[PDB]
Design a protein around this ligand. Structure first.
Ligand SMILES: CC(C)=C[C@@H]1C[C@](C)(CCO)Oc2c1c(=O)n(C)c1ncccc21
Ligand SMILES: [Mg+2]
Ligand SMILES: [Zn+2]
Length: 324
């Protein structure tokens, strides 16, 4: 089985890697083997003196703290966002733009960006007076928790994969990781897209035809939208993968609606299993959220993302076709 897994891992540089098949072949360790594969591909172990046994130990511990009984926000989703971010980092319009520390931060942020997700939304945790909403004062409750867990696990035995970074380097990475994961809060999507459009309008390139980023504000803004695009990348994948992600998020939404109904609360959108329209929700999800975001990203890295945008529009056309 080790040979079959190594064959599938050869697609790690490709959009639409079959991450579910990799989860099978790796014994439900997609996050660990995909992160390890990416770290070798980018030669991140030698650059930052990361001991290989420290890396595997942390990745296994981080993967354990993703809930296996949550349908969508599990370790497969984490591995999917890591691998999608890895491909977006390699796009020609961004060649040699980001340093090795920014690359490490963006990939590490993707790996921890949903750790210990309980399968319910921020608003549910706020409305139900949960301990998490109490700890974090109703502000980016899940995203603050993911960061806290992801950093604390570095202190477990033989788990500090940043042990050989300089104190300056650790200081810069920690701030960049926090800025990125906090930007995955869906309540910040509109402001994140609005700033991304302003950058597309005022786009500037270098003499090598490569995106020019002068300052931390523009650089972290591109990294924020990149991980945000990978988080919202399910409808841009081949349909057989997209549909599996749709089935998983609808199961998670339906389970929250059952808890909302059992508590006497008003059911959140798309969460009532007795009056849900999966196809129309997917169409509205693409039209109002996913396509505006990816169309803007495609303008930023034009024409590198045209095939991804083509697949998204074909999938939107298909989900529409099932309605009549
Ligand atoms: C809460 C809102 C507004 C969006 C969420 C964002 C989320 C959780 C991002 C991944 O962490 O994924 C999807 C969402 C959603 O509403 N739908 C319909 C989806 N359909 C198919 C696949 C993923 C999603
Ligand atoms: Mg999240
Ligand atoms: Zn996510």
């Amino acid at each position: 089985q080790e040979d079959v897994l190594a064959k599938e891992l050869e697609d790690v540089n490709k959009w639409g890697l079959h991450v579910f098949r990799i989860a099978e072949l790796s014994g439900n360790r997609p996050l660990t083997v995909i992160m390890h594969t990416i770290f070798q591909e980018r030669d991140l172990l030698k650059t930052f003196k990361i001991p290989v046994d420290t890396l595997i130990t942390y990745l296994m511990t981080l993967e354990d703290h993703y809930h296996a009984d949550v349908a969508y926000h599990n370790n497969i989703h984490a591995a999917d966002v890591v691998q999608s971010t890895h491909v977006l980092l390699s796009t020609p319009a961004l060649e040699a733009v980001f340093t090795d520390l920014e690359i490490l931060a963006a990939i590490f942020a993707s790996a921890i960006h949903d750790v210990d997700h309980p399968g319910v939304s921020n608003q549910f945790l706020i409305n139900t007076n949960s301990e998490l909403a109490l700890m974090y004062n109703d502000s980016s409750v899940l995203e603050n928790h993911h960061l806290a867990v992801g950093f604390k696990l570095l202190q477990e035995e033989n788990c500090d994969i940043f042990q050989n970074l300089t104190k300056k380097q650790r200081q810069s990475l920690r701030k960049m990781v926090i800025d990125i994961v906090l930007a995955t809060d869906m309540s910040k999507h509109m402001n994140l897209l609005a700033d991304l459009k302003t950058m597309v309008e005022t786009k500037k390139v270098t003499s090598s035809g490569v995106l020019l980023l002068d300052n931390y504000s523009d650089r972290i803004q591109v990294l924020q939208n990149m991980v945000h695009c990978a988080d919202l990348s399910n409808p841009t994948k081949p349909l057989q993968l997209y549909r599996q992600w749709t089935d998983r998020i609808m199961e998670e939404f339906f389970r929250q609606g059952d808890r909302e109904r059992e508590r006497g609360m008003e059911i959140s959108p798309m969460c009532d299993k007795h009056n849900a329209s999966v196809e129309k929700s997917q169409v509205g999800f693409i039209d109002y959220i996913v396509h505006p975001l990816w169309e803007t990203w495609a303008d930023l890295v034009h024409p590198d993302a045209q095939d991804i945008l083509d697949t998204l529009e074909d999938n939107r056309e298909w989900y529409q076709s099932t309605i009549p």
